[PDB]
Design a binder for this molecule. Structure first.
Ligand code: HEM
Length: 454
């Protein structure tokens, strides 16, 4: 019925140079603001459409019709993350395998086990902060990465990164980032396969080794342990497939460790920053949360029962996830020829790309008060129409990490607010940094301790 809009083009460079910025996802957000609920984005060799309406995304999330696609980002990350859970097709052997063997360690009862371990890390950060001098401050995104990377480490593989013991960032993180930059960077390189890009290839290739250096070291610390863990490394190593009958390959085992080491802390870092960013800008909300935290968290350290009982802290996080989904995009492909919206024709295997932040700012569904931070939006959570809100993605290919991140971050956001008054001491104008995921760049706060003992 209708042709699909398309932003400015540059001859054979098609759209590519529109996203020649350090802030792509946000440029994509502007174009979606100019062009509307869907638009064609062509780059040499790839074409993909970006959806922003709950109308369209509604259909796209329908699995009978669309399956998960590897966006050009994931097809590049396959270089280090192989065919782990995140970067593999539903149709590959190791997905459904990996899926059944690992899903168990993510039930809200596996949570129960992970709690003490989360607390371990949560106290480490709380103490880091009680121990700062006046005139010292808190570099927020840096600290959250410390925490969330210590947790996926300690819980996932029983491995202390001892992130707090360090003021120079961790030898694994450094490389991880260059990697997750070379990825974010090959994208905007029209012919990504020739050199000049051989200096970069080698830089990439020298980071993969460094990661695998650590993956090798983690396999080795499990060996010299009086191994006991229920932890997901144990699961991977010894588990078998109900569906199939076999255990996972060793090369696949490596890929998943990297996958869980990256996905594990990356997304949940941002969401905390963003959460805490919003609390310092919306001090009414802050005092509401302050209140809940002190009322519920009565024992010196929180028990699992208590964290599930932080109902409003859950809403603030969802609302932070609403405005700034830290994993802001996912792709899907036309299983069959079809017509999205009764309006837009697509052919088999045509790629489309849910643009979460714009889906999360869709008036016909949320209200006209979209840019505003109001958690109360989450009270009757029946309210959200089907597929209005998707920080965690869709159907069978959604974040297996949902319960976990959310438990984690509830617990941590819980404790900070029990323990500290906060001051945006510089009047931080928001600066979103984009690796694959989003997070506040240079967010800094002071923290007046409320002298409550742990
Ligand atoms: C609040 C934090 C998190 C956010 C916002 C988030 C977001 C997402 C999104 C959007 C996807 C789907 C991408 C796609 O369809 O291509 C995904 C998948 C995935 N996430 Fe998360 N995630 C979070 C936390 C975690 C955590 C803590 C873990 C580790 C336990 C994790 C592990 C994974 C894995 C393994 C997948 C691939 C699942 C599959 O395809 O079978 N995530 N996540």
């Amino acid at each position: 019925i209708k042709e699909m809009p398309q932003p400015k083009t540059f001859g054979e460079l098609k759209n590519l140079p529109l996203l020649n910025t350090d802030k792509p996802v946000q440029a994509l957000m502007k174009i979606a603001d100019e062009l509307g609920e869907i638009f064609k984005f062509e780059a040499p060799g790839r074409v993909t459409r970006y959806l922003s309406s709950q109308r369209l995304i509604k259909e796209a999330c329908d699995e009978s019709r669309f399956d998960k696609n590897l966006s050009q980002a994931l097809k590049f990350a396959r270089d280090f993350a192989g065919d782990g859970l995140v970067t593999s097709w539903t149709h590959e052997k190791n997905w459904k395998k990996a899926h059944n063997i690992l899903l168990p360690s993510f039930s809200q009862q596996a949570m129960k086990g992970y709690h003490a371990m989360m607390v371990d890390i949560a106290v480490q950060l709380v103490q880091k902060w009680e121990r700062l001098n006046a005139d010292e401050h808190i570099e927020v995104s840096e600290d959250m990465t410390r925490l969330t990377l210590d947790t996926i480490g300690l819980c996932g593989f029983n491995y202390r990164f001892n992130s707090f013991y360090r003021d120079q960032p961790h030898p694994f993180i450094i490389s991880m980032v260059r990697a997750l930059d070379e990825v974010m960077n090959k994208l905007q390189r029209a012919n990504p396969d020739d050199p000049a890009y051989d200096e970069n290839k080698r830089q990439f290739q020298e980071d993969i080794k460094v990661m695998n250096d650590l993956v090798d070291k983690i396999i080795a610390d499990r060996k010299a342990r009086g191994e006991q863990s229920d932890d997901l490394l144990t699961q991977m190593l010894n588990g078998k497939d109900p569906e199939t009958g076999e255990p996972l390959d060793d090369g696949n085992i490596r890929y998943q460790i990297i996958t869980f080491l990256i996905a594990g802390h990356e997304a949940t870092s941002g969401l905390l920053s963003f959460a805490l960013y919003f609390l310092v800008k919306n001090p009414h909300v802050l005092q509401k949360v302050a209140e809940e935290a002190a009322r519920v968290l009565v024992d010196p350290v929180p028990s699992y029962k208590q964290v599930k009982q932080l109902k409003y802290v859950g809403m603030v996080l969802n609302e932070a996830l609403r405005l700034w989904p830290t994993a802001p995009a996912f792709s899907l492909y036309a299983k069959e020829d079809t017509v999205l919206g009764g309006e837009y024709p697509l052919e088999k295997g045509d790629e489309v790309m849910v643009l979460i932040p714009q889906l999360h700012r869709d008036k016909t569904v949320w209200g006209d008060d979209v840019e505003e931070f109001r958690p109360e939006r989450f009270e009757n959570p029946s309210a959200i129409p089907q597929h209005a809100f998707k920080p965690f993605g869709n159907g069978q290919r959604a974040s297996i990490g949902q319960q976990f991140a959310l438990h984690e971050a509830t617990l941590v956001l819980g404790m900070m607010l029990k323990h500290f008054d906060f001051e945006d001491h510089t009047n931080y104008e928001l600066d979103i940094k984009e690796t694959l995921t989003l997070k506040p760049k240079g967010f800094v706060v002071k923290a007046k301790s409320k002298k409550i003992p742990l």
